[PDB]
Design a binder for this molecule. Structure first.
Ligand SMILES: C[S@@+](CC[C@H](N)C(=O)[O-])C[C@H]1O[C@@H](n2cnc3c(N)ncnc32)[C@H](O)[C@@H]1O
Ligand SMILES: C[S@@+](CC[C@H](N)C(=O)[O-])C[C@H]1O[C@@H](n2cnc3c(N)ncnc32)[C@H](O)[C@@H]1O
Lengths: 98, 1024, 297, 99
């Protein structure tokens, strides 16, 4: 899993492409700029002051009337997982029974 | 040098002159949005093996590809992709030309950010129309971004005087890219968001922002001429995979790309081409207080600092980069040996050298600081690379004045030994057979049977079989029986018999053949039958009918030839079967088979005809029987021996059978047979010393090859240990030819020193006490890639030249004439005197030449002497004395140099040898002995003006004759005794040619004999 | 004439502006192989006249020559490009040689030898140097002169006397001229100095004739006028190349020389405005009755 | 027919003791040899990552460890524990005894 090259392409295909999906996308870090430093002293120690590390990505409010889009990170992730499972059911050598 | 992997600085260069750049026009926007053939916003990259397009490079009209390629949906082939991009840009082209007229907006500006995000939102279909009217910029560049039209955080967000943008997708991967190392690298520039850029006005405001912003992954700047205003680079945790051993993150990938671009710019700087950016490197700003020493980002920061200073690498970089070379570079940079430069990266400011050729501190103002306290002892000019050749090239050493122990050289060559590997053998002997013939003369002499010398009794030794098998396996032919039969027929049809006045034999003789092998990979008979029937030999008469006999035929019948089977009698029969296969390894049964086979051949000859015998094992009974029986009953005879194999067989030919004649053996036949057995003994003693056919060499034998392998980091003055190693191999090899090779061995540039040892080199190495050492400069200048070759035992393929042959002749007779413990003098020593290799190890020299030599002066066991004094003069032999004079090839050279005749040169030389103290002498004179022959292409003649004019050397000199030489020699010395040496027809000299591992090409040695009878030497004692 | 009378390289030789001009010239100039052109010129001038000793000529066919300093990189035929046509006699003004040996530490077929230090080898009737004094040097006139000393000494001692050689000299100094006048000019029969010109440089091609024969022989005023005019034309063409702009630049109307274009649009066959008329006539006054081309699209 | 029906291999590989189903080689000799070439290229890059050529220019090996290493890499059987036993110690077999 560390080096994707060790997984053989034609002779471990689903493992190879699932590892490729994992290294290609997974949530990225981010930060939000909370708080005030003036009246309140900085309670964090290891980060710089008043910053808040977030394990997924944010983009701020485009508009205040929210409506649906799919061009974001977690619907992206769910779409890739479903693409793998469609490919897995597509490859006939794994299940001959269905 | 070697920072961690070696770099070849030796000087440092930088691009001095600079293009100031132009800015945007909307006319240019339409021009490069129209994808013309001459210019278009993309540019393809291809493989280095298939030249197939696996990646593309795009630039200024589009940068907003930050979204996912699943949302985009591009095809897989480059042609369909580029026409797809063409038609989508055509649609957006029509849209933007609807919303803006060209006439009013002929020369107005734009936001490049709005342009790139516009084409990105159009390709991703993400409602670009709110972004559309913000195209034409206002008074400033960034205030339109701060006061936003519509906040579009999917492309760019504001932060109170600091603009955040997501620059993405400088490159784009095509689906045929498969992480091959020969494929070009990508540097993680094809992912969704490799980094984030912070465009704003001033670095003070940006650092006040970085007080609160995270700086965990490091921050990169450009400091020279930014793309769209002053900014920073914030790489993310996405990593680069395309290097197979190493996994680097985004910031290291960008810094490595930028530093390699600066390394490319530092070589191409030729003080006339202005470039688009003065420097390239990034200079990590705030991460130095986060990450620490011995980290990869820190080490690449060191390399980027040295690159901005203007250093240049060791290996020549490719024009198109590969993952293979990139990973080799990363493996070299994480190696060892931390630093040798006085330079260290900083966070307070950037630093450039006091003697740096860059002028970028005076060019732009902020950030670039000139340092005064740090100085460099290096040079200023550029650097060039040498042109590689695929063939191994020769090298010649030059000796210095220092010396170390030969035991130290032995220790260093034992350290650097790469002896145990199998070499390619080759062939010791090419060409054809040699005409060794003698005829019967009636009135010549008379000898007896018992006087003849024989085979040596040490014939059936395993060592003798070893030597003869070594010779017969090393020797190269077509068909040996073809060569032997052509030689014996060309010598058979020469002379005339005393009975008939015409000749020996005629056309249409209805011949017979004995002992046909009939296996020659086709034409199942001996290979002379068809060309000899057609008359293709062109020295023979063609026969009428040919019958082949023997118990291995294909067309005839198989008959025991030893027991007499009567058949049809033919005018000429030819025996070719041995007595070994029919024999049972005994000289008695060999002689008895000779008896029976010769008896049947005599009784089946159709008398008045002739026959040819071959005899492998002649004995007392054989010679006594043929002298008592055949020699009376024969008219004439012939015995010849062509030579391709080391053996004792001869070819006996009869003439005129069944006529009585008082006829015995003669002393000319005796001298021929003595010299035949003697040359057999000498060449067997030669072949006994040589190693086997398919062996491995390990430096144990006195003759053989030797190679060593060292590696050279850059143009560094390499160590004394490797210098002692190379000079010890030089002392081991003894001024012979040598070839080198320079190539990257498995991640490191290596050096090979390939040559061959010899016993003459062994006596040279034993002659001197200390070994001298060499100049490393002639090895340290080279920077080209000399591709290696397989180790071969024999360098020469076409054969030795006749001039090499005469040099070997002369060296052999000088080495034979010299003895141990003797002062000598060499007149005209040449470039490197072979007299050092000829004489024994304990005898000194007093040698001198007009040519200034580079022999190692001093550190000898027995002393040497090297100087130049224009030897054809006087006064100096009264100073330095000797015992025996060796003047080889310098007589004609000095006579052609001084334009004077051999008579005057020889009388002056014999005058200054009456000044000498030598009792014996031997000099190279140029005297015709036989009637001159005007040898084609080597030696023509001149009757009147008396010159020779060698065309191969392009040299020319007169000749003097032996009676005038005798006149001058007896006018000088009334007591002297002269002995003209005979020509080495016994091949005693051949050991000094074979042990130096060089083939001969026997036409060359025939020309060498025909030439050596035209400049012989003599031996003159002062007494006699 | 005497050695001290000769003019030299200008002391403002190692300027960045001088390197700028010479790199501009050598990059703007168009050739095939410069070494091919130089060697053809030096052989065509080498085989012209006769020596005063022999009545016939300088050299003949089949001289068994040697070569020094082979670059061996010419995109194929890994040797200098005159060896095969000169062996075939394709120059049609030369006699063809018999054997050719190429020396120098960048060869492909010969051996790599330091030519400065004397390594003895086989003596040939004619040798040809082409090794510079820059790569083996270390950017100093003193070490350049010393390499000229050592290389010329080795070339003299490896000449097979009665023959000839050709020298190239990039950096001649007082020591160089004084040394060759005190040493070689006595011991030579005749000589020759030529200069073919494709690059703006101070190098000349010195040719010797009849080595190792003593002769009362010094420099002459015709050689002096040739050398004065050579350094003078170097100075003039360097002053020319110093003013011209660079190779890969962008023009903006700032330099005194360069191009100029403007772009106007013409609606129909209308009598266009006075403003565009002043613009076109101002470009005419800027261009000064030179050639000009237009385009309508 | 002079068609390649069998191959002969030697010293750099001997550890093919497992089953050819588990291996999975193709049927044509050209595809088989390029497959062997690229798998040896991957293991080549791995072993040159873990050992530098400069320090280990002329050091020895266990031939057993080499053959079992290429066999475990072709059979995908967790070769990495076998990996650091490559360069041999003072003797030949004591590294095998003390496993
Ligand atoms: C080596 S050959 C000559 C072959 C062929 N002439 C050539 O020169 O290439 C001698 C032949 O004589 C045959 N031979 C030996 N003893 C014999 C005998 N007593 N009678 C007949 N043939 C014999 C051997 O079988 C052998 O093939
Ligand atoms: C640029 S060249 C002349 C090129 C040559 N005319 C040709 O046709 O390729 C000078 C050559 O001499 C070599 N060189 C410089 N100094 C040298 C020395 N002291 N001994 C031997 N070779 C030297 C350089 O490496 C270079 O290859």
């Amino acid at each position: 899993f560390m080096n994707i090259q060790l997984i053989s392409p034609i002779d471990a295909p689903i493992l190879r492409q699932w590892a490729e999906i994992i290294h290609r996308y997974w949530p990225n870090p981010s930060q939000i700029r909370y708080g005030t430093p003036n009246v309140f002293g900085s309670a964090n120690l290891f980060t710089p002051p008043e910053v808040l590390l977030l394990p997924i990505d944010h983009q701020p409010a485009n508009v205040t009337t929210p409506t649906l889009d799919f061009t974001n990170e977690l619907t992206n992730w769910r779409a890739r997982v479903c693409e793998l499972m469609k490919n897995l059911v597509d490859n006939q050598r794994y299940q001959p029974g269905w | 040098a070697n920072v961690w992997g070696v770099r070849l600085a030796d000087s440092l260069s930088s691009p001095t002159i600079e293009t100031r750049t132009r800015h945007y026009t909307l006319h240019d926007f339409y021009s490069d949005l129209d994808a013309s053939v001459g210019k278009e916003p993309w540019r393809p990259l291809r493989n280095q093996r298939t030249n197939e397009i696996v990646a593309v490079q795009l630039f200024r009209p589009l940068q907003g590809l930050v979204f996912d390629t699943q949302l985009y949906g591009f095809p897989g082939t480059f042609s369909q992709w580029e026409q797809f991009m063409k038609e989508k840009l055509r649609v957006l082209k029509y849209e933007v030309l609807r919303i803006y007229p060209i006439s009013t907006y002929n020369h107005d500006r734009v936001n490049v950010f709005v342009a790139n995000a516009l084409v990105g939102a159009f390709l991703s279909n993400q409602a670009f129309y709110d972004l559309l009217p913000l195209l034409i910029v206002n008074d400033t560049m960034i205030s339109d971004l701060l006061g936003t039209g519509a906040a579009l955080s999917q492309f760019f967000q504001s932060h109170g005087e600091v603009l955040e943008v997501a620059a993405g997708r400088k490159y784009l991967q095509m689906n045929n890219y498969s992480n091959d190392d020969d494929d070009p690298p990508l540097f993680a520039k094809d992912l969704s968001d490799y980094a984030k850029a912070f465009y704003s006005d001033t670095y003070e405001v940006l650092d006040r922002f970085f007080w609160t912003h995270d700086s965990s992954a490091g921050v990169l700047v450009h400091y020279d001429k930014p793309t769209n205003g002053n900014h920073y680079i914030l790489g993310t945790l996405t990593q680069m995979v395309s290097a197979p051993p190493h996994i680097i993150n985004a910031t290291d990938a960008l810094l490595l790309e930028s530093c390699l671009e600066q390394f490319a710019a530092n070589v191409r700087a030729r003080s006339a081409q202005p470039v688009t950016r003065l420097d390239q490197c990034y200079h990590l700003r705030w991460g130095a207080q986060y990450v620490g020493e011995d980290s990869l980002t820190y080490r690449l920061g060191v390399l980027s600092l040295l690159a901005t200073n203007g250093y240049q690498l060791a290996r020549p970089i490719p024009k198109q980069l590969t993952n293979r070379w990139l990973s080799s570079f990363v493996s070299q940079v994480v190696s060892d040996g931390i630093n040798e430069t006085p330079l260290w990266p900083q966070e307070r400011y950037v630093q450039i050298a006091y003697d740096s050729p860059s002028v970028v501190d005076g060019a732009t103002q902020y950030g670039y600081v000139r340092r005064n306290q740090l100085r460099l002892g290096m040079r200023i000019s550029a650097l060039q690379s040498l042109s590689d050749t695929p063939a191994p090239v020769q090298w010649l050493p030059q000796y210095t004045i220092d010396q170390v122990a030969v035991d130290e050289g032995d220790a260093m060559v034992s350290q650097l030994t790469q002896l145990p590997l199998r070499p390619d053998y080759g062939s010791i002997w090419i060409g054809e057979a040699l005409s060794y013939y003698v005829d019967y003369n009636r009135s010549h002499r008379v000898v007896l049977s018992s006087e003849l010398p024989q085979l040596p009794d040490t014939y059936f030794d395993g060592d003798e079989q070893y030597g003869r098998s070594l010779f017969s396996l090393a020797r190269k032919v077509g068909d040996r029986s073809l060569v032997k039969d052509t030689a014996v027929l060309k010598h058979a049809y020469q002379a005339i018999d005393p009975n008939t006045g015409k000749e020996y034999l005629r056309a249409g003789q209805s011949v017979a053949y004995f002992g046909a092998s009939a296996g020659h990979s086709g034409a199942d008979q001996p290979l002379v039958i068809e060309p000899w029937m057609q008359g293709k030999i062109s020295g023979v008469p063609p026969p009428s009918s040919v019958r082949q006999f023997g118990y291995d035929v294909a067309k005839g019948a198989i008959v025991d030839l030893a027991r007499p089977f009567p058949s049809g009698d033919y005018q000429f029969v030819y025996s070719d079967v041995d007595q070994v296969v029919d024999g049972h390894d005994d000289l008695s049964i060999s002689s008895g088979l000779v008896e029976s086979l010769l008896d049947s051949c005599v009784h089946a000859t159709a008398p008045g005809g002739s026959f040819v015998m071959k005899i492998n094992f002649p004995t007392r009974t054989v010679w006594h029987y043929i002298e008592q029986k055949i020699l009376p009953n024969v008219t004439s005879y012939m015995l010849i021996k062509p030579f391709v194999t080391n053996n004792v067989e001869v070819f006996f030919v009869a003439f005129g059978v069944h006529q009585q004649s008082a006829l015995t053996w003669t002393s000319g036949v005796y001298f021929f047979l003595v010299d035949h057995f003697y040359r057999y003994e000498t060449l067997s003693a030669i072949s006994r010393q040589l190693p086997s056919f398919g062996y491995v060499d390990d430096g144990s034998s006195v003759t053989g090859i030797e190679i060593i392998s060292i590696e050279n980091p850059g143009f560094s003055n390499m160590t004394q240990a490797a210098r002692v190693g190379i000079s010890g191999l030089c002392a081991n090899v003894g001024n012979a030819r040598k070839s080198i090779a320079i190539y990257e061995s498995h991640g490191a540039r290596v050096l090979t020193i390939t040559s061959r040892r010899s016993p003459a080199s062994a006596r040279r190495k034993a002659r001197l006490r200390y070994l001298p050492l060499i100049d490393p400069r002639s090895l340290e200048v080279q920077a080209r890639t000399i591709l290696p070759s397989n180790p071969v035992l024999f360098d020469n393929i076409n054969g030795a030249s006749p001039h090499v042959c005469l040099t070997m002749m002369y060296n052999f007779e000088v080495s034979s004439a010299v003895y141990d413990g003797d002062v000598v003098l060499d007149l005209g020593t040449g470039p490197e005197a072979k007299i050092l290799e000829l004489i024994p190890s304990t005898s000194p020299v007093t040698c001198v030449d007009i040519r200034p030599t580079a022999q190692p002066n001093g550190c000898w066991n027995v002393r040497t002497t090297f100087l130049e004094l224009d030897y054809l003069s006087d006064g100096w032999i009264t100073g330095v004395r000797g015992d025996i004079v060796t003047c080889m090839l310098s007589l004609g050279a000095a006579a052609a140099g001084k334009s004077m005749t051999f008579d005057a040169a020889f009388q002056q030389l014999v005058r200054v040898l009456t000044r000498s103290t030598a009792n014996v002498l031997l000099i190279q004179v140029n005297c015709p002995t036989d009637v001159i022959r005007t040898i084609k292409g080597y030696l023509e003649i001149d009757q009147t003006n008396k010159r020779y004019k060698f065309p191969k050397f392009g040299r020319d000199e007169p000749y003097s004759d032996m009676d005038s030489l005798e006149r001058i020699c007896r006018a000088a010395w009334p007591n002297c005794s002269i002995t003209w040496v005979p020509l080495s027809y016994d091949l005693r000299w051949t050991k000094l040619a074979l042990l130096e591992s060089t083939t001969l090409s026997s036409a060359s040695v025939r020309i060498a004999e025909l030439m050596y009878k035209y400049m012989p030497i003599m031996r003159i004692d002062i007494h006699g």
